[PDB]
């Protein structure tokens, strides 16, 4: 028992376990010398006022005779300054009078002290520490109740049989941790836990929250308060080497603390902080000297509990009045940084309490203090139930309660499994199967007092714990300032929600949290910013310039009343009117009715075989063979060796061949798709070979017959040598049919049939000239 | 202290911790009743003879006065039947007299017993148990030395400061575990560990061994002795649902035991067993009732240690002589299954020792027994060093040894850090930084005694521990029988080493342990069975039928002396000889010298323009134009309107045009690659247009000139109307040059130039007929 032992007598010893220092030295006893304990080198005024709260509620339960009359209460309280070694050293001293069943050597002077047993005990802060000692207490079923350890591992009543707590489990915390960025709607996030049993199981639970919500986890590192500076350099190189503005820290204070100093030295700004409440209310972190990089820190916290007499008991302090305190004197000379002694001067003992800004007194709220304060009263209330035994009707084997003069900690734990009673602020606080309770969490922001530069902890909503899943959250969205000041929401996806036409693909190797969006052209119709694929639009439709919705058309190659064709139709109509005036002058002065009608019919069927494409407008290509063959038969049968009925042995033979090709030809336009951008066309789908066959067998045959007959008439001037102009009209016309063999066989595009139509029309006009002009010039 | 407490007095208490039962019951005290200890329901005769070995070496060290004269040795030995709860209950009773520094209430009658302290202690079997108690003993620096716990975690002297052992670390075990299948050269393997701190760190170390050796791990499951039958069904569904004949089990006995029963019920055969030595010497596993599926089990083991008096002390047993034993009576009535009492009858106490086949006595070897037996002697030897203090020159702060009448366990541990002494079988057994030693491992096989059906454990090699990495292994390959009997090696890759031409690719999604081999055709040259890709072979070479090495050629289209061309050359030579006899008869009876030489030169240049392709053999196509144009000029200039020098105004004009085309033509064969399989060709790379230009401007021009001149001579019989046969020879020849316009313009393959050559040759023969026959038939 050190001078840090905190003890006063009483009928039930309690004992408590507390971090008087955050840090412990790591000196190495090297065993040529005798070993000894190691110094613990930090402080925790929050822990010291937890002690003050402990003995305060001790004083309440002793003084207030409604709370257990005629009974005084022992305690032997020790200083677990985050060292499980010292914790073990403590708890062995705890289970000594409880270990008197195994003690079998010291009979006649154990009664020389006759010290009773510690029937239950306050638990501890650190989860690893409490799990260390829970293994010891599960032997003896000593009821131990932690005030701060809140891991899901301790719910295992197989190993940790004898353990309850006064704090909710971490699972709703990890739940709401997923839910707040579910609200904040992000994809690329990175987390940090601590290297312990508070960091690892909580981050595993939260990792499964994230894998429900499908968030590409950028990193997951573990830390301690005794970490390597090279490892800290490694993880800050990770932090500088990643794309995650959001940072989940799921640690305690002193574990993030060297990382905090390393960052405020290293000075990376912009990354923002989800906060574990183990450090989210901690002025060693919450420093103005740190606030140049920390701000907008968002954490849960327990609601503030209120204690009558709290600050009063805090200021009821004196070093000479330390009748039962362990570290009052060190506390006095440490707060005041002097050296009272029974350089650093002799302390007055009378220095003003609020002359210093101590976190013993600098609080705004009471949370784990409050948990302690209610925890001891829950112990007192189960013991009050034991005090008020129902007479043979208790919770025992046949209800026989133990007497208060001879109690049993297993029976204590039996009553502790079932407790149902109200709080000092009127909350019916029961104990579930985990042996805890659960309240809501104020979700806070880390703002600054503009009057003083003091970091103020400003709630921007709260997480209810009583609604359904997906129903337990409140957001005060109004007081939200992202990164402390900026009311606008930042970005923690990996890729952007891209542009419209960029079809949102994926990236192989990388999770689909981060992906690509492929710029899909040429009929995509992709106007949604996150369309995964494209849309193949309709056949008359082609995409916009940004590969957007399709409005643009394909080709429209018809050329019905085109402006190029208007002048050619004017030339054709002029030739028709000139031929009409010529025929009028000739009739006043077969060549006027039949041959002139065949020539003007091949010149009017050339006009009718232009225009738009249709079925019959496609099928109309026959009369340019027929009427022109009749006009050519007029030339081949107006010879001097003298025809309608008699040279119909040729002409009607070609006419029956024309009826055969009329039966054989296909009467249907063909709007083909030759190209793809300028796709549509008109092709007229002609049947097999009837056009070239009729051309060779009629027109070229008549030209050859006229040449073979007029081979003698060329060297024979008859009717002023009309064979010369006859063979010249045949030269123009056979030049058409044999040079637009190559020209209309070497045509292209929407002028292909137009070229043959112009060839036939010009050949008609030229034959009309070289025949009728030579006929009727005089 | 139970009746299982094992105690006799003496100046230094030792204490030991042992599994009297494998299994402990899991009854649930439900706290309406008073709690109590839980029964431990199994047995371990190997542990009971470990006790016998313990007290045997105790007896040695007491009796043998060379080992510590004038000093008696206490012990208080307890029964850690694999229950860490009972272990904790034990070790608290251990550190009680050592905990007398904290004991501050029992002064005047602690001396009523005056019990001294337990200065050191035997460790424990289970790694979890020893790590539990090592946390307790690191407080007091009580030197604890395990006999069976062998995990690498305990080498951490930060937490486990006060711990040494008598067993090598698991790292060489995992090393050799990689090395044996490295020898056995496999790729797809699956492992099984246990759900503890012996299974998990060992399988992590071995997993990193495997990831060095790059073996696709099929599965990794964890087990315990208290596992769920649904989980056992899950992992046996994994075992039936995988492709891994090799199975690494890295557990203890009772963890694999329910899996062993589940498998021998479930009856899957064929899978083979790498073995952790914690169960590889265990007759509960090594059952003949199990040997129907277990066999060929290959495990390491520690070498056999030998103890004088071993079996002797084993048979020095009696229940009434149990002057210090804990479980002798239960052992007696459990071995004999009777009920001696101070139904199951009253035991005689005189039953024959080897009347039963008990694994207390059924051994072949002594291993962990031997570790215990040497461990206590190492303790005795460090204490013998303490007994022989060097007078002020010890290992202390200035060498002042502690007296033996007042000792200190920290000083004990200081001397225990440095020990250097020989074994009973003469091994200088020191203690390293882990505080252990390391010997080789007999690598055994699980064969069967054919005389008795007894499972015999047959070494097939050993793993040395003193050579280098990659040097520490011996294999007796001769006694290797895979799966117990089969001397041939099995298969534990995933894919096969495939066929030759199948180019060994990979599989996306699956590790390259298991992969594909793509059947690569068409010039692969892939004759290696595991070639990753193919080989593009030479241009004259094409792959075999199995896409193997390329030997097959491409095309060889040359046709120099082909058998089809031999008969045509015979026809040409026959026409030449007939023309020679015809010219001889005509000269005896320009047409004989010049025109006949031009015709026979176009008929001999047709022969010279056949054969193989070369540069000049390509360039030779000019003379078929030249000499035939001279022969045609003979026909066009032997007219009746009468030539060499005068019609050279045409003929020499064409000859200068022929010299111009001779300058313009390219003289080079072109072995092109038209196809790819039958690739090679011959194309002769002719220059631009000189052939068609010379043809039209000379041959067709001369034919037109002859027709336009003989238009009158056709209707004119002169020299018996030779214009008829003249125009008939021109009909054959212009039919050649104007129909092999289409035929030699519509040719294909290696007969393309052959067709034009045959056309020119036949045209020469036909012109020779239709001229010279009509000339000289009479
Ligand atoms: C980060 O990624 C998530 C996933 O797409 C985005 O959440 C989407 O938000 C839009 C509206 O903002 C909703 O219509 C979608 O239904 C959400 N997706 C899912 C899967 O629910 C989020 O918006 C992204 N962040 C930013 C800043 O755009
Ligand atoms: C925790 O959150 C609950 C919300 O489920 C709070 O409930 C409030 O209850 C009062 C009276 O029952 C209502 O008037 C309020 O409207 C409720 N608040 C809501 C619905 O947001 C509850 O007070 C909170 N605190 C505790 C300790 O339970
Ligand atoms: C299982 O896979 C390994 C990996 O390829 C094979 O080991 C190869 O064995 C051949 C000869 O057997 C050696 O030439 C190679 O060098 C080995 N590979 C490596 C990476 O070293 C093994 O042979 C395969 N098993 C079977 C049965 O073929
Ligand atoms: C462990 O293996 C070593 C091999 O490194 C054994 O060494 C033998 O040593 C003797 C004498 O020194 C030699 O004659 C043998 O040839 C060695 N065996 C070999 C090289 O295989 C050693 O005996 C083994 N056992 C122990 C306990 O160390
Ligand atoms: C840290 O970085 C921020 C980023 O702008 C900068 O404003 C600030 O001055 C930096 N501080 C130090 C100490 O480098
Ligand atoms: C009532 O209590 C007695 C004594 O404790 C016990 O023997 C008895 O079994 C109990 N009765 C029942 C019904 O449990
Ligand atoms: C027990 O708890 C229920 C629910 O909170 C409550 O209604 C009841 O009054 C409680 N009983 C006692 C005795 O506290
Ligand atoms: C188990 O399977 C093996 C496989 O052939 C078979 O030989 C053996 O008879 C089976 N045993 C039982 C009990 O099903
Ligand atoms: C020798 O031993 C004495 C007493 O133990 C000690 O005071 C002294 O420092 C030692 N000398 C040295 C050099 O360590
Ligand atoms: C110490 O160990 C070394 C190496 O085994 C040996 O040579 C030496 O003899 C040992 N000394 C003693 C005193 O055992």
UniProtKB/Swiss-Prot annotation, chains A, B:
Instruction: Look up what happens after changing residue 417 to Q.
Output: In HHC1; loss-of-function mutation; the quantity of the mutant receptor is higher than that of the wild-type receptor; dose-response curves show that the mutation significantly reduces the sensitivity of the receptor to extracellular calcium concentrations
| Effect of substituting residue 720 to A | Abolished G(s)-, G(q)- and G(i)-mediated G-protein-coupled receptor activity
- Record field: transmembrane: 563-588, 590-609, 616-639, 643-664, 689-708, 725-747, 752-773
Is Magnesium one of the keywords? no
Q: Please give the annotated consequence of changing residue 503 to K.
A: In NSHPT; decreased G-protein coupled receptor signaling pathway; does not affect cell membrane localization
Resulting phenotype, residue 82 to I: Abolishes G-protein coupled receptor activity
The entry assigns this protein to a family as follows:
Belongs to the G-protein coupled receptor 3 family.
Which sites carry carbohydrate? 70, 110, 241, 267, 352, 398, 420, 440, 493, 546
| Portion held of the full protein | 21 to 859 of 1078
What is the top-level taxon of the source organism?
Eukaryota
Q: Which residues lie on this side of the membrane: Extracellular?
A: 1-562, 610-615, 665-688, 748-751
Changing residue 139 to P does what?
Answer: In HHC1; decreased G-protein coupled receptor signaling pathway
Protein name as annotated: Extracellular calcium-sensing receptor
Q: Summarize subunit and interaction data from the UniProt record for this chain.
A: Homodimer; disulfide-linked. Interacts with VCP. Interacts with ARRB1.
The effect of residue 160 to C is: In HHC1; although the mutant receptor is expressed normally at the cell surface it is unresponsive with respect to intracellular signaling (MAPK activation) to increases in extracellular calcium concentrations
Recorded consequence of changing residue 319 to T: Mutation found in a patient with primary hyperparathyroidism detected at adulthood; inactivating mutation; mutant CASR is activated by a higher calcium concentrations than the wild-type
Q: Anything noted about its domains?
A: The extracellular regions of the homodimer interact in a side-by-side fashion while facing opposite directions. Each extracellular region consists of three domains, LB1 (ligand-binding 1), LB2 and CR (cysteine-rich). The two lobe-shaped domains LB1 and LB2 form a venus flytrap module. In the inactive configuration, the venus flytrap modules of both protomers are in the open conformation associated with the resting state (open-open) and the interdomain cleft is empty. In addition, each protomer contains three anions, which reinforce the inactive conformation, and one calcium ion.
